[PDB]
Ligand binder design. Structure first.
Ligand SMILES: O=C(N[C@H](CO)[C@H](O)c1ccc([N+](=O)[O-])cc1)C(Cl)Cl
Ligand SMILES: O=C(N[C@H](CO)[C@H](O)c1ccc([N+](=O)[O-])cc1)C(Cl)Cl
Ligand SMILES: O=C(N[C@H](CO)[C@H](O)c1ccc([N+](=O)[O-])cc1)C(Cl)Cl
Lengths: 215, 215, 216
């Protein structure tokens, strides 16, 4: 019948980043991309040993991180800075016949068995649907762009209006063999009003960790 | 004396990217850069075996792709989205004495011998002209920027105004040795309204393929 | 006490890039990032031989380069294009206890022993001060950002308002081993009105050379 999404109102005055947030909202406002050559040698072997698809498995890791730190779940409600209780993955699906992509969001759960079941359900449903947003918008989401075409050494998302655009964006490239290691390009872009080099740094470090500890 | 340029009006209704174009024209408007580490080992060996300069031969390969796929030949005319019959390369020539660059375009031809003849004629002519555009602006053109200074793992063009800026931009790096292979960084900035990940993707793949053939 | 900042007003009429500047200020205005996988093998072994920290040593090399070429020392003063006689580094300091970063600046000197003494004086002073700009703003400065958390293959900075923003920005990453070499990710962003490919090009080529020599 109905569902409500939860948030937390943050008073800037009590926040240790009050002066930074005020600056990257006005004078110093900027977004930044960064690309890493992620090692997924262990993440590939374990995914392939199991009856699993790479894409939703990696999605889950990302969402897990995104639901681990409040600096990623920030948005502007009614002119007020808030933190979502949870943030759901918006991922891209490619339609081979028409050469277009579509974006659909799955509901997030910590449990991987549960998340894949919701994912498969959404992809078995809207997977062949030609609409740009088969399910539509949801206030509390982050984005994952699949780029299986290019093993990129760089990726930069360059938006025209970045005002209040706090939702982080992942782009993942074509993985490849290098020595005894299998690496996958990963790009992350964020707003500086909500994310410092440190915030994105520890997440990307934990991103390596999780890709070396099962699904 | 007089010539008229290619013009194909796209009616947005009959297009499979109707709402895609609509979104990236307003709400989600953005450009995106990707750098790749291009293999040119076979390309350099065949260019060096013949009497060709590296620069014009590569320009041709890019323009061969640019004129193979309509998504790269898109532009806004009189408030309408059109596709140019053909698009011509605009390259940068460096003036070492004054430490500045100029931009001049050459007329595209599918025959390489003929295009290099045009290129030779154009560079022999205006190569020492200190005007920013010694030949002027032209509607149907894409960009190539030379950067033999730096072997970059990243390059990002970052336009202040991206309204209707559908013309794609290449930047090529200082090539270098790595084992047996010769890598040259290449980077494309493209408007998202006209190009999706897939579009840039197949062209980079075809860019690789074409480099592994002859000139 | 009192201090007058030196500059030189550039008349555009005589300048060889008058056409480019006018273009990259209106119609084709853009900034551009680029990341280089820097070879610091010789630079590390030299800094580690002495009792110097890596950060100030590198800060100095970048500043020595900005203050070498006028195209990095450009800005809009009172609606006019001026070149500062010198440009100072604004570097970042991370506070671990509160997980926020500050930005201070040290008056640049061509002599490394001198500079470091001022840098030390500033960090020993405001290194534990939790204000965003513990020293404040300065007309003539370039930016250096430490990113020791990620060994990035690409860093890209996208500013909202690039109007007249000619001050160059550096982002330096987590250095790592690659065979015999020790390489370190480095990004620069510049306004195309003040910087062409060649300017960034030679500075990064010189940056490699200055790293293969001594600390200063
Ligand atoms: O447009 C999408 N993805 C593209 C794929 O190239 C890219 O990741 C992107 C994401 C967000 C965006 N935005 O918010 O303006 C623009 C492009 C969907 Cl995820 Cl909405
Ligand atoms: O501006 C030029 N070249 C620069 C050099 O790096 C770059 O390729 C570029 C191309 C197009 C552009 N634009 O139209 O906004 C801006 C920079 C000339 Cl090709 Cl016009
Ligand atoms: O905010 C700062 N640094 C960040 C660190 O992520 C970055 O170097 C940056 C530099 C300049 C800038 N600007 O003025 O637009 C914004 C961010 C200070 Cl150095 Cl001003």
């Amino acid at each position: 019948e109905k569902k409500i999404t939860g948030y937390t109102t943050v008073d800037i005055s009590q926040w240790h980043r009050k002066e930074h947030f005020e600056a990257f909202q006005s004078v110093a406002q900027c977004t930044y991309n960064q690309t890493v050559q992620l090692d997924i040698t262990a993440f590939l072997k374990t995914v392939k040993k199991n009856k699993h698809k790479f894409y939703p498995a990696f999605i889950h890791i990302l969402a897990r991180l995104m639901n681990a730190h409040p600096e990623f779940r920030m948005a502007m409600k009614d002119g007020e800075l808030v933190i979502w209780d949870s943030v759901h993955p918006c991922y891209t699906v490619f339609h081979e016949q028409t050469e277009t992509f579509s974006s659909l969001w799955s509901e997030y759960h910590d449990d991987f068995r549960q998340f894949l079941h919701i994912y498969s359900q959404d992809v078995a449903c809207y997977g062949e649907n030609l609409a740009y947003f088969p399910k539509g918008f949801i206030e509390n989401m982050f984005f994952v762009s699949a780029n299986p075409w290019v093993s990129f050494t760089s990726f930069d998302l360059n938006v025209a209006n970045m005002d209040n655009f706090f939702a982080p964006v992942f782009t993942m490239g074509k993985y490849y063999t290098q020595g005894d290691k299998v690496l996958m390009p990963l790009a992350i872009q964020v707003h500086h009003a909500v994310c410092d080099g440190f915030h994105v740094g520890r997440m990307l470090n934990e991103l390596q960790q999780y890709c070396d500890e099962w699904q």
